[PDB]
Design a protein around this ligand. Structure first.
Ligand SMILES: Nc1nc2c(ncn2[C@@H]2O[C@H](COP(=O)(O)OP(=O)(O)O)[C@@H](O)[C@H]2O)c(=O)[nH]1
Ligand SMILES: [Mg+2]
Length: 528
């Protein structure tokens, strides 16, 4: 059909508000490998039938880049808000990302069936915090198909149709991908200009690598191959591509022979932020761990890893993740998809270290590599992030105190309503990736939410602490901490480790040292 009858949208909501539930009602309503680039047909009330494309988006800050790329592939977005919850951290962050991509935003208040639902409140938040017309808000219940058709109409009537020329040089944005054992590395794309069909020879603009398309199509919801994809469409492309790192998200696919003038803007290679050592546990061996990682990696273009060994732990891997959730996902899937037993060290951020006789600043991804000789260090910088927090006013005080305990600098504070506070803090990421999520959760009864974004590196007074077990240091336990927090971390780690190690005939003396100086000791008496 015509592009004027096409609608490209996505759903963006704080986790738990009903994104998945709603995608089903939408598909179910219209109807009669992960879910992505879903094509639907909808006969509107105006009589015309429209071709709708549901682009699934990540929900965690760890996948922020990927989220932006998915938004760049749509013309609009459904901003799903839980009527019993109201606006939360991810709600605001995602809203602005959508705003930045110039998307028509359709707010939908979900769970209006719940006894705790308060649509009037949420409407007030939408207008005051988001600056949207509460009137545009679509009340709904994805749990009870209430408001589905109303959504589909808003999408047809509110979201503009794609604007592109199928006669112009191909220009397709890669917003997602996965590895198909049979089709190879598969790219989920948005076609801006031109058309693409099996047999065509494409080219990846960031690499200049060329391939020959083997198949094109979309999920309906099953992976259906079409004979082509044209400007405005959303689907997938296969072309005998070795792996997902060849079709990086945010990249542009054009024709090898007649390439488009410029690629879609905003391309960025994956950037690991948090690292950790993963070591084989129980009976699992190194090989089984290595083999499992190689297999998992095939379906994950962001993860990086390299062989690492420690005195006590033996051989493992130093793995880099996009964040904490990404690490968790990898952990669970490694033990659940390949059933390997692993112990994971405390995570760490990448530090920039300038040492006296080395011209170039060194990037430290493994604490073990942080210079032991503190005298040789000219300076060290660490990544900082801007943290946004939304909480009921009753907990603002405890949260504020938690944030400053963790070296946070308050930059702003506002009320989203008479009982809801909004906060912004600049914090070292190293402080955020250690017990911040739970602390913030327990003190707010799980009511406070937060989000954050990298704002760059800043020099800080950090130092390396080493752990000694019976006068013998285990490098895998050394860590970097701010000089002012050292004593506390030392105590925490010492007291934590004692209860982390079982008894034995010999007394186990645990020591946390600072450059040869023990600043925390803990001992677990012999085996009874
Ligand atoms: N009562 C009620 N529950 C809902 C509604 N929408 C979603 N839920 C439930 O909220 C929980 C999480 O839903 P989900 O779609 O996975 O949220 P996501 O985290 O945004 O995907 C599940 O129990 C859903 O069934 C709704 O409109 N009303
Ligand atoms: Mg979901």
């Amino acid at each position: 059909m015509e592009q004027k009858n096409v609608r490209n949208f996505c759903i963006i909501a704080h986790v738990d508000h009903g994104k998945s539930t709603l995608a089903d009602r939408l598909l179910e309503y219209t109807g009669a490998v992960k879910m992505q680039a879903v094509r639907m047909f909808y006969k509107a009330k105006d009589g015309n039938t429209y071709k709708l494309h549901l682009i699934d988006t990540p929900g965690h800050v760890d996948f922020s880049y990927e989220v932006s790329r998915a938004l760049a592939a749509c013309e609009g977005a459904l901003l799903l808000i839980d009527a019993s919850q109201g606006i939360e951290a991810q709600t605001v962050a995602n809203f602005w990302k959508a705003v930045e991509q110039d998307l028509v935003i359709i707010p939908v208040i979900n769970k209006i069936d719940l006894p705790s639902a308060d649509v009037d409140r949420v409407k007030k938040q939408i207008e005051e915090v988001l600056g949207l017309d509460p009137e545009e808000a679509i009340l709904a219940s994805a749990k009870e198909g209430i408001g589905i058709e109303e959504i589909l109409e808003a999408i047809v009537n509110r979201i503009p149709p794609p604007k592109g020329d199928p006669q112009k040089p191909l220009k397709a944005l890669i917003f997602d991908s996965y590895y198909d054992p049979y089709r190879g590395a598969v790219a989920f794309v948005r076609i801006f200009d031109g058309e693409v069909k099996p047999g065509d020879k494409i080219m990846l603009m960031s690499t200049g690598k060329e391939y020959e398309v083997t198949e094109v199509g979309a999920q309906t919801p099953k992976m259906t191959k079409f004979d082509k994809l044209s400007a405005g469409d959303v689907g997938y492309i296969a072309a005998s591509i070795k792996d997902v790192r060849d079709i990086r998200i945010g990249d542009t696919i054009t024709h090898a022979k007649n390439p488009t003038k410029e690629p879609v803007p905003g391309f960025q290679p994956a950037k690991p932020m948090v690292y950790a050592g993963i070591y084989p546990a129980e009976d699992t061996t190194y090989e089984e761990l290595r083999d499992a990682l190689e297999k998992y990696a095939i379906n994950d273009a962001a993860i990086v890893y390299e062989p690492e060994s420690s005195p006590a732990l033996g051989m493992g891997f130093r793995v880099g993740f996009l964040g904490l959730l990404h690490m968790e996902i990898v952990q669970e899937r490694l033990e659940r998809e390949y059933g390997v037993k692993i112990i994971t060290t405390a995570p760490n951020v990448i530090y920039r270290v300038k040492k006296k006789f080395t011209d170039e600043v060194i990037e430290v991804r493994n604490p073990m590599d942080f210079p032991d000789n503190a005298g040789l260090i000219e300076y060290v910088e660490e990544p900082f992030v801007l943290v946004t927090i939304i909480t009921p006013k009753e907990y603002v005080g405890p949260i504020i105190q938690l944030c400053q305990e963790k070296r946070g600098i308050q930059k702003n504070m506002t009320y989203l309503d008479p009982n809801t506070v909004y906060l912004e803090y600049e914090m070292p990421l190293s402080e955020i990736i250690v017990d911040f999520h739970d602390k913030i959760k327990s003190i707010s009864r799980g009511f406070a939410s937060y989000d954050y974004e990298f704002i760059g590196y800043r020099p800080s007074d950090l130092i390396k602490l080493t752990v000694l077990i019976n006068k013998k240091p285990v490098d895998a336990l050394s860590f970097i901490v701010h000089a002012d927090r050292a004593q506390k971390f030392a105590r925490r780690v010492a007291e934590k480790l004692r209860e982390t190690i079982p008894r034995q005939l010999f007394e186990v003396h645990i020591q946390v040292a600072k450059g040869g100086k023990v600043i925390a000791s803990e001992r677990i008496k012999p085996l009874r």
